[PDB]
Each structure stands twice: as C-alpha cells, then as structure tokens.
Write a protein that binds this ligand. Structure first.
Ligand SMILES: Cc1cc2nc3c(=O)[nH]c(=O)nc-3n(C[C@H](O)[C@H](O)[C@H](O)COP(=O)(O)OP(=O)(O)OC[C@H]3O[C@@H](n4cnc5c(N)ncnc54)[C@H](O)[C@@H]3O)c2cc1C
Ligand SMILES: Cc1cc2nc3c(=O)[nH]c(=O)nc-3n(C[C@H](O)[C@H](O)[C@H](O)COP(=O)(O)OP(=O)(O)OC[C@H]3O[C@@H](n4cnc5c(N)ncnc54)[C@H](O)[C@@H]3O)c2cc1C
Lengths: 363, 357
C-alpha cells in the first residue's frame, strides 16, 4: 500500500521517485522492462539548446544539476557524468552563420553569456574540427550528463530511501473506485496506492485518456552512432542544426541523430548510419579512423500538445501526469521531479497544465 | 621516440603511465588486447583486507592515503569515477573458532590498526539486517574500503592520454631492443616502438621479459572465478570478508561474490562447481541472494610471482630496464604507490630497495 505508484522507470519517473522518496513518501516504480530501457538510455544528455515558458523551466532545471550530481554520487555511488565545458554551435556556410548570429543576439538579452567565435578561433580551442567551419557560438555555461547514469542514479536513490522498484511489470490500467485512485492494474497483479503518476514516455497515450482522448504522446525514433578514439578529438560537444557530436567519459564520441516520427521501431537502417557518419566527417574528419563501437535507436516522447503534461487531474483525485518532454526530458528531469513532488505535497498549485499546454494563436 | 614504453595496460601499467605522463614524460602504453582486459577488470577492488616488517605493509599504508584525493583528481581530470567507497569492511565469523582467530587478528594487529573494533552478531544485524543469524560477530574496519578496479584502470590510462600518452592497444611486445647495453625500444607485433626506458607490467604474462633480470624470476596466473547478482533490496552497505571469501556491494544494486583459486592456468572459462560452491557459501552469509537476479560470472588470472612477491625496481647492469609486475591479490590496493614508486625511481628520486627485500 503506497503513497504514489509511478508508471514508468525512465528518467522522468525515476526523477519523480527520487524527490518524493527523499521527502519520506512510500513510492513504487512500475516499469514494463527495466530502469532506463527506452528514451532515457538513448539520449545524448545535452543540457541547454526560440523563447517560451519552457526556456525558464529549463533555466531553473539547468541550475539544479551541479548540486544534484554531488548528492547522487554521495548517496548511490553512481556518478552521472555531469560536465560543464561549454557547447559550440557551428556553421560551415553563411546562411548558417547568420542563423546562429540571430539566435545568439536574442539569447544575449536574457542574461545568458555566449561569445561568437571565428573558424580559426574555434580551431585554436578544438583543433580536430574541420577547416570548413567559418564561425560558431560558444556557450561556456552549457554542459551534459550521461542520461542512463542519471536515470539509474535517481532510481537507486529512491530505492535507498525506501522506494520499491517493480521491473518487468506492465500497467494495463489505473483502478479508480469512487472517483479516487485506489491502485494500479499490472501484469503481475494489483498494486495498491493512493496516488498515481503517469511517466510512460512514448507509451503514455492510453493512460492519458482519463484526462482527455486527445491528450497523448507518440514516439519520434532517433538513431545514433558511437565511436571510441585514443585521441583528444573534442573537449566539448558541438551542435549543428540539431545534429551533434559529443564526447563522453572514456574516449567515447556519440553522434546523432535522425528523426523518424510515429514508429516504435528500434532497429537501425544502414542509410541512417551512412547519413550520420558522412555528416560527422564534414565537421570532424578524424572520426574516419576512430573505432566503431555501437549504434542504437531511441524513442523520443513527443507530446500531442507540443509540451509535456505535468499536473493533477481536476476531478479524479491522486491522478497525476508527467510525460511528453520530447527532446528535452534529460535537461528538464530535475525541475520535473521537484515540481511533481511539490504538487503532490500541496506545496505548489496545478498551474503547469495551464502554462505549458495553452498557446494564444491570435490577437 | 618515447621517454618510456610501458608493457602492460593493466592497473599497474596504467598507474605508472599516469604518474609519469603527469610529470611531463612522453609515455607509450603497449597492450596485447585492450586496457584493463585481464586481472584488473576481474578484481573485486578491495583495499587492505603480510608480517609487520614486510615493506609492502608501509607501501599498502601509503597507497590507501593517496587514494581519496587521487579519486577526486581522476574524476575531475578524466570524468571517470573510480567508485572509491570508504564505508568499512566486516571480517565475519560463523564458528566460535573463527571468532577467536578474528579477535586474534584484531588484538595483535593494532599497529595503529585502522581503529577497528569487535561487534556482536546481534549488533552487526542492527547495522546490516540481511546478514545471517549464523554470524556470531566480526571485526569492523571503519577506514577500510574498495574501488571499481576496471574503472580505476581506465581512469589512470585516460589521465595519461590526456597528458599526451599514446595507447597502443592490440599490440604484443615480443622482445626489448637492447643496443650497446642500453634500451632503444620494444619489438612488437605492429612495428618497432622507439623508447629510452621500458617497464615490464605484463601481469601473469611477464615471465619471458623478466628473464632479462634472472631466469629464476617469473610470474604465473592463479585463476579466480567470481559471480555477480543484482538486487532491488539493500542487502549490504559495506563488503563482508571471511578467510579470502567476499561479498561486496557495488554502485547500482550489484553484488559481486568470490573468489575461487586455481593455480597455474590461464584458462578463463568458469566451472559450474565453482558457481555452485561460491553461491552456496554466499547463501549461509546472506540468504536473500537466493532471490536476487543472476547477472554474470567470470574468471581472472591473479599474477603470482615465482618469489611470492612483486618485482619492482631497476636492472642494475642494463640501462633503463624496469619491472613492476606480480602483485598477486593486492594489485588494486598497490596501484597508486606502485605507480608513484615507479615514477620516483625512473626520475632518480627513489633508491632501489624492493628488489633487495
Ligand atoms: C536520440 C535521442 C537523443 C536525445 N538527446 C537528448 C539530449 O541531448 N538532451 C535531452 O534533454 N534529451 C534528449 N533526449 C530525450 C530524452 O530521451 C527524453 O525526452 C526522456 O528520456 C523522456 O524520459 P521518459 O522517462 O519520459 O521516457 P522513457 O525513458 O521512454 O521512459 C518511459 C518508461 O515508461 C515505461 N512504460 C511505458 N508504459 C508503461 C506501462 N504501461 N507500465 C509500466 N511501464 C511503462 C517504459 O518501459 C519506459 O522505460 C533524446 C532522445 C533521443 C531518442
Ligand atoms: C578474482 C580476483 C579478485 C581480486 N581482488 C582483488 C582485491 O579485492 N583487491 C586487490 O587489491 N586486488 C585484487 N586482485 C588483484 C588484481 O586483480 C591484480 O593484482 C591487478 O590486476 C594488477 O595486475 P596487473 O595490472 O599487473 O595485471 P593485468 O591486469 O593482468 O595486467 C597485465 C596486462 O599486461 C598485458 N600484457 C601481457 N603481456 C603483454 C605483452 N607482451 N605486450 C603487451 N601487453 C601485455 C595483458 O594483456 C594485461 O592487460 C584480484 C584479482 C582477481 C583475479
């Protein structure tokens, strides 16, 4: 008999598990496979990168990462790979240069420090980078983490604090008896609880029907490649119109990512492998003579409302939702967990439904 | 040309690589397979758990003092966390005979002996509630701990690569090139690697190369089989030790249990009887393991020396030939000082004692 059962053991559900259990709530994670089985183990873990109410949530989440990391390491033994060596936006042609200069110029007015670099000035800092790069924007405060490690950290933190983790357990439905959540119906039987959180990434749609038929998430498949190198090829991640090359602990380079909407398919097509690597060669040619390590596919949970659903059901008491983070669920995992636990404890109002899901279209 | 070529990409070779490169030396590492692919990936990473005047004793003491701040240094430099944990280790007893020998180790080991104390079976179960009713008591060592050996090994080696070392994985050293009684390089499977110094750190395979010291010298593998299970429950905060057998928790709900001892074999398969015996012994110490989740099993070749002690030092007659292999069951614990000693010795800031005693 739990305070909250959490449906899904990705970063988002594990983050929620962490913050609740930390505050003495008896919590259960129910996950149909394993912790970090899906988007959260496929993600490149980049933090930061137009305006909107997410930008501010992101900024708030971003700032939690330094202390969160230290805490998690100390408590669980897992280091999440938090790194802050900055991130480059690169440009290889003039359209791209201007696109980047314009982003920077609106960004700068918000207080975020960033410097425009010349191709030669980039190459002083990152010498393996292509002669084709003509400029770039450097953000010294950006960084990244190891998505699966952060995920695993949250979940074991939760367990240490008393959370029960049920892997290989699928939630078919929520048990609402008198317009109240009384439990959850799983493949391994009933789990009694007083509150539920839907954190089912790309699979949340059916359970989101309790809120509304049109509420939902769908998978946007992304394929990525990883290579190893004995050279110091990149110090910091490089970005180019969503495409990225990122270092990780241990001389690993992670490179992606394709976009294939509305499929749960986790195979990798050759063409994607070829397309990804050829693009990487124009940025960073030495990757030709690196060591192939792996390739994989992950399922970004797009929102039907183009913003994650984070909130309490207005009628059915104890029924919560927290999914649809799409491309920024690693970045936002800390703010999401913190918020959800505040909301579950009555410490915050149910205002993030309103704020994130309505967009004024006219006027 | 390199100031030093290091033969072996284990924790020992990679320590030496770290400490050296960190002092502006140009180092190559030459490794048959890949970094940390033998004993150093297989090890349980326990620290500290010899007679009192054995120098390894002073060395082990110094190794343990370098470890905390080294862990920070490697993390912040390479981004690799070595799993340094200092929550202690319990030497358990299940017989009254064991209790005696344990109390005996404690009493006559108080060489400022890590402020260790006796706990009753009941007081241990307070501290660790899944441990067996069968344990009478144990000696808790508060300043005892453990690392993740494969991780420490990787840290060290990336540390050196960041400091300019060239890692030649997938490269076997056949022989050491000696022209005019000085070392000019190392003859490998790929090409010739030109260096002014070499360090034999080839663990259990060092024997042929050690013959340039004395045909009497050599190392050999002592096979060890280990089992790893995963768990959602909190079965242990700190490792338990018992006459070489150990149950150790690792970050991420993992529990590695071992180990077996099969001497004079390089063979890396695991015999079912070893799994059967390790697990059955484990069940008496921590019954919940019955319903944990099986993860994996493996073997590693502990590098025993012909002389039952590491070879660490410089060749008296041959200019620039060094050795540092054969740490048997303490290779992880001594990787920091083995590295620091070896680099101090190459820079002529340390005398050549260990080769004598
Ligand atoms: C290629 C790629 C690169 C990315 N890069 C970045 C990046 O650089 N920065 C960034 O912030 N984000 C990135 N992301 C996004 C990030 O992966 C997601 O936004 C985030 O992982 C979503 O986490 P989640 O827990 O909601 O989803 P998931 O990790 O998919 O978790 C959902 C979990 O719920 C479980 N589940 C579903 N239904 C049920 C049920 N009925 N019962 C029980 N369990 C259930 C599933 O097993 C799954 O484990 C990237 C994604 C991809 C694919
Ligand atoms: C089961 C087990 C548990 C253990 N537990 C502990 C513990 O709890 N605490 C502890 O302190 N220690 C422990 N050890 C000991 C520790 O594993 C070793 O002492 C440690 O590996 C250090 O050895 P090394 O680096 O010399 O050996 P290795 O890791 O074997 O390194 C030797 C390297 O040299 C390479 N090599 C060999 N020949 C050549 C050549 N011609 N050219 C190039 N490369 C070559 C090999 O490929 C190998 O990678 C344990 C060992 C085992 C097996």
């Amino acid at each position: 008999k739990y305070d909250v059962a959490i449906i899904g053991g990705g970063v988002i559900g594990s983050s929620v598990a962490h913050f609740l259990a930390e505050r003495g709530h008896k919590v259960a994670i129910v996950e149909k496979q394993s912790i970090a089985s899906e988007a959260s183990k496929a993600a490149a873990g980049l933090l930061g990168v137009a305006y909107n109410p997410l930008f501010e949530l992101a900024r708030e989440s971003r700032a939690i990462f330094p202390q969160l990391a230290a805490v998690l390491r100390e408590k669980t033994g897992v280091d999440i790979g938090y790194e802050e060596k900055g991130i480059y936006r690169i440009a290889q042609n003039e359209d791209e240069k201007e696109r980047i200069l314009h982003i920077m110029d609106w960004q700068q007015k918000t207080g975020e420090d960033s410097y425009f670099l010349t191709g030669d000035h980039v190459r002083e800092k990152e010498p393996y980078l292509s002669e084709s790069i003509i400029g770039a924007v450097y953000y010294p405060k950006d960084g990244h983490v190891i998505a699966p490690e952060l995920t695993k950290a949250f979940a074991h933190s939760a367990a240490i604090s008393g959370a029960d983790i049920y892997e290989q357990t699928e939630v078919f439905d929520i048990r609402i008896e008198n317009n109240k959540v009384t439990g959850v119906i799983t493949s391994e039987g009933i789990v009694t609880c007083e509150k539920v959180v839907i954190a089912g990434g790309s699979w949340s749609t059916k359970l989101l029907s309790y809120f509304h038929r049109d509420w939902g998430t769908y998978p946007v498949k992304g394929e990525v490649v990883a290579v190893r190198s004995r050279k110091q090829l990149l110090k910091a991640p490089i970005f180019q119109e969503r495409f990225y090359i990122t270092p990780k602990r241990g001389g690993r380079y992670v490179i992606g990512a394709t976009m294939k909407p509305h499929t749960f398919n986790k195979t990798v097509q050759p063409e994607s492998i070829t397309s990804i690597l050829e693009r990487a060669y124009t940025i960073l040619p030495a990757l030709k003579e690196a060591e192939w390590e792996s390739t994989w596919a992950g399922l970004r949970p797009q929102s039907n409302h183009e913003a994650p659903y984070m909130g309490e059901h207005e009628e059915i008491k104890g029924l919560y939702a927290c999914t649809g983070h799409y491309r920024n669920g690693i970045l936002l995992s800390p703010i999401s967990g913190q918020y959800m636990a505040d909301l579950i404890e009555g410490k915050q109002e149910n205002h993030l439904l309103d704020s994130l899901l309505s967009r004024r279209v006219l006027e």
